[PDB]
Design an enzyme around this catalytic site. Structure first.
Site, mmCIF file in Angstrom:
data_model
loop_
_atom_site.group_PDB
_atom_site.id
_atom_site.type_symbol
_atom_site.label_atom_id
_atom_site.label_comp_id
_atom_site.label_asym_id
_atom_site.label_seq_id
_atom_site.Cartn_x
_atom_site.Cartn_y
_atom_site.Cartn_z
ATOM 1 N N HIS D 100 19.008 -15.639 5.482
ATOM 2 C CA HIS D 100 18.057 -16.584 5.561
ATOM 3 C C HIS D 100 16.572 -16.332 4.765
ATOM 4 C CE1 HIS D 100 20.570 -16.600 9.249
ATOM 5 N NE2 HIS D 100 20.665 -17.861 9.190
ATOM 6 N N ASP D 201 36.028 29.573 5.555
ATOM 7 C CA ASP D 201 37.487 29.813 4.924
ATOM 8 C C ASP D 201 37.579 30.655 3.534
ATOM 9 O OD1 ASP D 201 40.559 28.060 5.699
ATOM 10 O OD2 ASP D 201 40.180 30.170 4.719
ATOM 11 N N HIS D 204 41.735 31.188 2.751
ATOM 12 C CA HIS D 204 42.556 30.382 2.222
ATOM 13 C C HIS D 204 42.441 30.492 0.588
ATOM 14 C CE1 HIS D 204 39.216 27.766 0.943
ATOM 15 N NE2 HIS D 204 40.005 26.964 0.305
ATOM 16 N N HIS D 209 44.846 28.360 -2.970
ATOM 17 C CA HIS D 209 44.424 27.905 -4.406
ATOM 18 C C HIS D 209 45.066 28.970 -5.658
ATOM 19 C CE1 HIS D 209 41.512 25.143 -3.226
ATOM 20 N NE2 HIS D 209 40.967 25.746 -2.422
ATOM 21 N N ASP D 358 42.985 21.828 -1.249
ATOM 22 C CA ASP D 358 42.309 21.790 0.064
ATOM 23 C C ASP D 358 42.861 20.714 1.109
ATOM 24 O OD1 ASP D 358 40.559 24.086 -0.207
ATOM 25 O OD2 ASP D 358 39.470 23.182 -1.854
#
Ligand code: FES
Ligand code: FES
Ligand code: FES
Ligand SMILES: [Fe+3]
Ligand SMILES: [Fe+3]
Ligand SMILES: [Fe+3]
Ligand code: NI
Ligand code: NI
Ligand code: NI
Ligand code: NI
Ligand code: NI
Ligand code: NI
Lengths: 194, 437, 437, 437, 194, 194
Positions: D100, D201, D204, D209, D358
């Site tokens: 509007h 982490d 990991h 990786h 990941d």
């Protein structure tokens, strides 16, 4: 190559005849020429050059029509109310209005700029047997539209066209017809040039 | 569900346009209770003609009977619950279920059961296994509505004060026809977002549709940019006891159509207006050729002039299946009818250029109602508040002096809140005793 | 959940095929409690062989142990909960988690933990971190089932009176092999829709599959159009205490296969029938070469003759992952085995032409159970009601005299209702004390 | 929600990563209460500059004011609730609603209302209709955070002991710049799965990786296969009262970047380290050129060295919109800044090759939390448990002697559990009185 | 152009050899001819002329095969149970049965009439080195199927074909093989002619 | 054929110029040659022959770039911070690293083997007007990736390439640029070679 519609129970008379048209109308040179034409047209639309498209690719006498066909029983006959609604059925002026709405800086839906990608395949062509300047063209289109970060809509269509050769070498669209295959599109709208 | 709409329908929690549990509750208190648009006589004109329609989330077969009446039934077989009909419209004297072959009449009666003699015998009573019927079917000048609740008021009483405004076009013009098939498309917005926009949103036209107004040169170009009111005046807006309401923009018979439609449509409307003035008076003959935008509660909206008839069929709290028909006056030339039908889709159908603008508003509103913090923001429906009248000598219902106004938003949401806070029609009536005061 | 199925399993609320909360409840009272099909010996024939299977919505690794036994484990690492195995089948002596490298044996034991000596020391007890094991694993003639509930009846007792009907094909024919891999496809229907169709739907064949019968000339062409019962007789249908049931169409060893399969299959079955009659008697030797369609409660279905083995793996209330295997008799010629395997997929696999017909029924039923008004319609399972017997001298269980009948629907849904209204096996037993009366 | 995390944050129910009702509860107890990352000064550097950001599921406009301050507002019009801004970033002195035409200032004030004089008059009070403002906006060295809860601790106190670890890079290095625009992609994992991976982490890296380490020859090749600890030592991990935590891998300034980035980055970091040692001491100057991986509670994660800044924007219990920025030290040569920016996306952006590894972990964990049986499995965060210290003379907070450790998982989940079991900040404080003991 | 499968660790011997086949077999005239053939075939299927397709485009000796391959670990070796299920493995008679089921007025699933649109791309061709009348053809297909108002299924496939030249000038399909890329199709079924 | 960017309000100067480039650069022989090149490239990528692709189809000087453009208002001007993030911006060594990660037996995401299908359409080409050994190529791509039973991701892109003719007859990619049309891909990642 013809289709026997008595044995081929799913095939309409209309579709059978068109198939034959494009079968016998095959011409290698025409195929190359029309493939180039449709690729150029799609590129122009993808970069949103709607004025250039309307001026250079579309004839003054254009009929630009996209229908949605109501789903009827294959086996009943009696119900004869019109089975098609025109999602588009536009003349040149009506296309001009749509083009000017697309380009207007106050078309709120078009900010930020939307992204179009068109994939044209299965091109076939046939010179009209009466009017040799008229080219019948069939082609299938996938149109991808992305906007607003995570909105993606993909359209699928067969374009049944008549194009006309122009004095000077150009070719312009005089009719495009699409029988849109999804009765209820789940693409938010159908506000795209198929 | 008690405090979602404030007193006098002045504010609404944005959450209403996104809440999952509320949608389920609406299927009980809104869609199970109210009159819902099915079809027009002109789409089922002959015995055996049928259309599929939605009533809320349910699907019904709406069938022209051999005696000329209309009955509607849930589209569900009474054996194992398979959907019975898959065509959107047709003609048939009966409906056979594709699973086991049970055959029903167009009157919903179970007529044939394969292996009845060999295997069922007296273990089946076909009279107890007819299709589940919609108990209330009524019409308003050819427009057929259904209701799941046998206790509903008659349709004419449900339309209330809104009927008077509809009559010049719907009753006195010589008959309307609904032009099918409708455009259909799915939009990611709540059904209420469309309903509120159509019930009373004159305010958006000049802003939302600024580009469309420039391109098509619609008569609404007068209010472009929300800079000036129409030269004809601010118009009217009304609402009614059971929630239906509409605005009136005086004289705007071509509505949202482009310049190429204006001369021929205006000439047709002006000519009939002259005749009608002698039958129903000057004011009502002018209403006949004015632009009305409204909603017939809960989810049927319309425009007159640029003549459209819409159903906002709910799919879930964030998804609506939008149906768009054109309507025409029966005595229009056939070429004009065809032009009107195409022009409606051109503006507001699935590929409608105005619809693109409207949907831009509908989807985000509804999306914001789903978001935790944003859902607690109020929508406000304050435009014209404190100046509505009741019992005006000329204009019935609760009436405001502007089509750019929120009179009909307030009435829509008042009725909505009364329904969601009620278990039945009697409770709605108690909650609505002072609706105009 | 108390009144969803009526007395004697005669009616079911359509809502059961669409209700979200009920699906969640089923994961507790159906899938957490009952025997669920895992695999066949022939798919994990050697030590270290494994398959992934679903048990309800959960995934398990089903592994052939070094000692020849079979153990199954949730496919979830005990460290941070990563999925352990992504292949559908294979051979391995252990399973290493790709996140941090924890290594488990095929016996589920945690064997290796990277940095155990350097970083864990006594902060880890590997004996407490084995894969979560399925506590019950049993077989029926090579067909291996699992159960999450240690209190379940033995598998053979769970099959109840259904076992007698299965034995001619499953036990006495010289061994079956399950032919992998299965066809897999997602269908938008509730798992129960398929389960009911397979447990007892002889009635649909002649109608739903009319076109398929004409095209392929299956032996089922006798009941085309639901016009006439089979010349061999109406057949049989049975049900059992724990919900399993099936129909029998006498003699129809080629089942849903086309004419090109009939002569060779019929000759093979007829020859073995002659031998079997001397060992197990005429009636049971005929059952061996008849068409049985059934469901092993809750969600494992089968056809004999046109030999198929199916799992309706639930995804949600409206979605099922459908697995389709062929099975063959071990002593069939290898070329016949290959033809059977292809013919099963040709009829009822993901590109099965009969399956297309069946799915047409499954999806809409389930869709209607989601819709507010339609969900209150009852499905009726009345075919043959009042004529079932128990304690027949020849045919055990609750038995009706027609494979076109709903005897086994009633038994399936009785067991279903007893489970959803019970918290454990003891409560199911109490609710099932008079199951046959 | 009381027993989802065990004492000392040692275990977590896997269900937390998949439960729908819990996600809704988090929008109240996590996202409505805590500090959430918005933007950096460098992305809104001039008056009128704005960015859109998400705060939980809500969207906010974050605007540089004329006086140099920053204010943020829900991206929702106060009239009917339409989304106000659709660009992701820009410069504007005000925001006009496309529905509007209401016009707001960059200060959130309602400034212009079309037809105010003609139709509203005194029925509108613009001072009551400003955009809904985020009540708390604070920064940490240019990094701007918002909070919906006016009772929140100051941002610096909320960072707690984590601030000390961040300061060498964030405060003492001469200024950081955030490089936009961020990569954005949707991942089918719960926001907490990413948050836990980044908070602590280190474990990991060498496994998840392994391929990336071989291909790119990152400095992290030292821990490949989880075979050996880094030659520099096991590193550190810390956590803090309000849930933020991180690991430290000593010396690893090039982080997850490939060999082509290592010489130039290492030379830059080594040179500044020498200068910094004189200002902040040897240990903290080494932290400056080490690899820190952490999470600023709840859903903002970072890496230093291979300098990344991430937001895990929740969409639903199984879906996250992942934002990835690079950051650079202001005094880096411009060519190095560009190389860093590209290298961040190359490793962990939408087409990041490490990110692929990941995400392989994040999605299944979250999927398993949705499954009935699997959701009852505990995640364990036991690495380093029983050896964390508090009140160390050199390293503040709760500290463990290894970046391959779960010290910061335990602190993250302790704070998480305290929030979900509390109605307000005062209750969180009571639940956290003994957080380090 | 050959692929070294020792260095290219993800490439099967089968795929390496096929790549070489289509590389060295390139012929401009053949490319045009086969593109036309596949466009005609797709048009015929899209209009549901299944009898015309089976009679004119499919050889009596046809093997029409579509497999679903079980997902196995790349690194294990030992498990040697058959890894492929035949979703289709049809001879001419089996195709005839399927065609007659599609066209039967009592195929309930096909009422109202379903809508097909096919997009054929990446066409390559090579004449067989022994049997010159045999044309090896590879092509990628997107198939869009719409039905029942709001059902849309999109299929994606690579067709590995052998076509045969016929006395009189025609060309007919003698083998089509598709290794369907989705293990669990989420398209309700795979009841389409790829 | 040129676009008037004053009238065609949605068209960038950049896009207008490229359209003209490809319009006037049309050559039938080049079209066929480049279509074959791109079909071969896509086939090689689909069978995951990434080493063969990098060695034989990619030039040492490659710039392989895919951007995501931040969505900005069409009407504002002032905000001049960089509007594009490089999802890829790779030289040859960086591509080598990515290729070796794809092929490594310990890339856990790639077991079981993933399935790729590429659809290349709307190919156009133009010889560079200065460096005739350089071929400008535009093409549209649909890439279908299926893995893990029920994961399906479909990517849509326009590739703007420069290819270079090599001594001996080969053609190698020296630049690929993609302005990726979805700002926030809903395909889990963008880890595919477009
Ligand atoms: S479900 Fe309709 S006849 Fe059985
Ligand atoms: S989640 Fe499996 S080793 Fe960590
Ligand atoms: S909703 Fe924003 S001005 Fe009305
Ligand atoms: Fe509008
Ligand atoms: Fe069947
Ligand atoms: Fe990582
Ligand atoms: Ni046609
Ligand atoms: Ni021009
Ligand atoms: Ni091959
Ligand atoms: Ni013929
Ligand atoms: Ni460009
Ligand atoms: Ni090579």
């Amino acid at each position: 190559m013809m289709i026997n519609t008595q044995e081929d129970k799913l095939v309409s008379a209309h579709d059978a005849e068109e198939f034959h048209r494009f079968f016998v109308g095959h011409d290698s040179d025409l195929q190359q020429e029309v493939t180039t034409l449709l690729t150029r047209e799609a590129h122009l639309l993808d970069i949103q050059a709607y004025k250039a498209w309307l001026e250079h690719f579309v004839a003054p006498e254009i009929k630009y029509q996209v229908i949605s066909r109501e789903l009827r029983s294959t086996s009943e006959r009696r119900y004869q109310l019109n089975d098609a609604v025109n999602l588009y059925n536009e003349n040149y002026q009506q296309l001009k209005v749509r083009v000017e709405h697309q380009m207007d800086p106050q078309n709120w839906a078009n900010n930020p700029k939307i992204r179009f990608t068109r994939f044209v395949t299965n091109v076939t062509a046939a010179k009209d047997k009466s009017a040799p300047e008229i080219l019948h063209v069939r082609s299938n289109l996938i149109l991808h539209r992305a906007r607003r970060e995570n909105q993606v809509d993909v359209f699928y269509a067969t374009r049944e066209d008549k194009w006309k050769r122009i004095e000077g070498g150009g070719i312009k669209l005089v009719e495009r017809f699409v029988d849109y295959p999804e009765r209820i599109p789940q693409t938010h709208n159908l506000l795209v040039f198929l | 569900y008690q405090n979602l709409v404030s007193e006098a329908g002045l504010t609404q929690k944005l959450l209403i346009h996104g809440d999952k549990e509320l949608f389920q509750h609406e299927l009980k208190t809104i869609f199970a209770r109210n009159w819902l648009f099915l079809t027009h006589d002109s789409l089922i004109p002959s015995p055996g003609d049928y259309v599929k329609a939605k009533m809320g989330v349910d699907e019904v077969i709406v069938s022209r009977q051999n005696d000329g009446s209309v009955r509607a039934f849930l589209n569900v077989c009474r054996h194992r619950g398979k959907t019975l009909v898959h065509a959107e419209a047709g003609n048939a004297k009966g409906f056979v279920c594709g699973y086991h072959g049970w055959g029903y009449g167009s009157n919903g009666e179970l007529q044939s059961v394969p292996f009845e003699k060999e295997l069922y015998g007296d273990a089946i009573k076909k009279k107890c296994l007819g299709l589940k019927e919609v108990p209330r079917i009524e019409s308003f000048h050819g427009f057929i509505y259904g209701c799941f609740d046998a206790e509903a008021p008659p349709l004419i009483d449900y339309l209330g004060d809104a009927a008077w405004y509809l009559e010049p076009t719907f009753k006195y013009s010589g008959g309307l026809e609904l032009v099918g098939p409708p455009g259909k498309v799915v939009v990611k917005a709540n059904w209420k977002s469309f309903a509120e926009n159509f019930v009373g949103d004159g305010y958006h036209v000049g802003w939302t549709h600024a580009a469309a107004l420039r391109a098509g040169q619609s008569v609404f170009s007068s209010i472009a940019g929300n800079a000036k009111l129409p030269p004809e005046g601010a118009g009217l807006q009304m609402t009614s006891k059971y929630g239906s309401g509409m605005g009136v923009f005086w004289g705007y018979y071509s509505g949202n159509f482009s310049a190429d439609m204006i001369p021929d449509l205006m000439a047709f409307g002006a000519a009939k207006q002259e005749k009608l003035a002698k039958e129903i008076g000057d004011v009502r003959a002018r209403i006949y050729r004015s632009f009305l935008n409204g909603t017939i509660f809960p989810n049927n909206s319309f425009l007159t002039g640029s003549a459209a008839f819409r159903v906002w069929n709910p799919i879930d709290e964030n998804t609506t299946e939008v149906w768009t028909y054109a309507f025409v006056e029966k005595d229009m030339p056939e070429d004009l009818k065809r032009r009107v039908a195409d022009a409606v889709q051109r503006s507001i159908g699935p590929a409608g250029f105005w619809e693109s603008d409207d949907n831009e508003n509908m989807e985000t509103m509804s999306q914001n109602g789903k978001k935790y913090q944003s859902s607690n923001i109020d929508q406000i429906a304050s435009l014209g508040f404190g100046k509505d009248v009741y019992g005006d000598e000329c204009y019935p219902g609760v009436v405001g002096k502007s089509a750019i106004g929120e009179t009909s938003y307030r009435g829509f949401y008042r009725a909505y809140q009364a329904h969601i806070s009620s278990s039945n029609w009697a409770e709605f009536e108690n909650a609505s005793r002072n609706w105009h005061i």
